[PDB]
């Protein structure tokens, strides 16, 4: 997986899947390895599935591919979430 941070919106809650529970994660990929890696990374970062705002994923029944998007903006309510996730990445890549 390749991860980038920028200011482009590619998924919307009124068009694709709003992942709220790890059981619902099964609708985002066609391979068990990819699902396992996604859950692995999200739990390594430190996301509480049933306590923090969800993230968005695309359903498998499309010939597009695999994409998943997280909101980590630095304003409004999400500001606070931006802190949490931030620290997460700060403890894995040895840099940021």
């Amino acid at each position, epitope marked *: 997986f390749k991860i980038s941070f920028d200011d*482009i919106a590619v998924l919307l809650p*009124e068009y694709d899947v709003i992942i709220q529970h790890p059981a619902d994660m099964s609708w985002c990929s066609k391979s068990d390895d990819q699902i396992w890696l996604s859950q692995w990374f999200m739990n390594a970062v430190g996301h509480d599935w049933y306590l923090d705002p969800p993230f968005l994923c695309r359903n498998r029944t499309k*010939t597009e591919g695999f*994409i998943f998007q997280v909101n980590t903006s630095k304003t409004g309510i999400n500001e606070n979430y931006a802190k949490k996730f931030k620290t997460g990445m700060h403890h894995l890549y040895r840099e940021y």
Partner: antibody, heavy 126, light 102 residues
């Protein structure tokens, strides 16, 4: 230069299904979604049909749901649209346009029409 | 996702700076495009994602906004611009007519 031609239009009686052709050349036709859009004479535009590059997933507006259907021939670089159960309200100008599925490093159905044809006229009248 | 435009008809002259506002029912981030149309012609896309400018488009056009509200701005109005303009996210806008004033 990207070139696109539309044909298969004119004046037709109601109750007859019509087949319209949209030929494309100059780009990788197998890797770009296609759209059909409609404008009634004197009114604004309206998105009608969309097909992605794989040829598997389609989408249509509710006003033509169940009556219109688009397919494509990648070998012949052609797009074929069928219209059925025609009414007087479907008389309009039809365009077929190529979508831009790449924006700054991402691939999806952005619903951006980038290259257009001269536009055909369909007159459903008796 | 409904969309609405303001105003419907606009009057301007050569060299004027003109603004068009487009409001969506619910937040769509930056998923919006601005199109130009002339009488008896084919629609030509102008603005990507409310920010970027398509190659070949005059530099006097630009866009801004986000979320639910967006705006198209023309700094200097040229004779080739008296036309109809549309903003599209899901469907098209109702159309704003940039028209000469006399």
């Amino acid at each position: 230069q990207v070139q696109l031609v539309e044909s298969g239009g004119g004046v037709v009686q109601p109750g007859r299904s019509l087949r319209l052709s949209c030929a494309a050349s100059g780009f990788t036709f197998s890797s770009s979604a296609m759209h059909w859009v409609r404008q009634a004479p004197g009114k604004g535009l309206e998105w009608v049909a969309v097909i992605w590059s794989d040829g598997s997933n389609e989408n249509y507006a509710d006003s033509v749901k169940g009556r219109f259907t688009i397919s494509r021939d990648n070998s012949k670089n052609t797009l074929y649209l069928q219209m059925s159960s025609l009414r007087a309200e479907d008389t309009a100008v039809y365009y077929c346009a190529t979508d831009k599925t790449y924006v700054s490093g991402y691939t999806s159905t952005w619903y951006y029409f980038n290259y257009w044809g001269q536009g055909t006229l369909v007159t459903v009248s008796g | 996702i409904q969309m609405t435009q303001s105003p419907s008809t606009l009057s301007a002259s050569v060299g004027d700076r003109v603004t068009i506002t487009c409001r969506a029912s619910q937040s769509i981030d930056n998923w919006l495009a601005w199109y130009q149309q002339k009488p008896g012609k084919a629609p030509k896309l102008l603005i990507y994602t409310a920010s970027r400018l398509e190659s070949g488009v005059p530099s006097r056009f630009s866009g801004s906004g986000s979320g639910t509200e967006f705006t198209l701005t023309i700094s200097s109005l040229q004779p080739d611009d008296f036309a109809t303009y549309y903003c599209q996210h899901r469907t098209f806008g109702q159309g704003t007519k940039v028209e000469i004033k006399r």
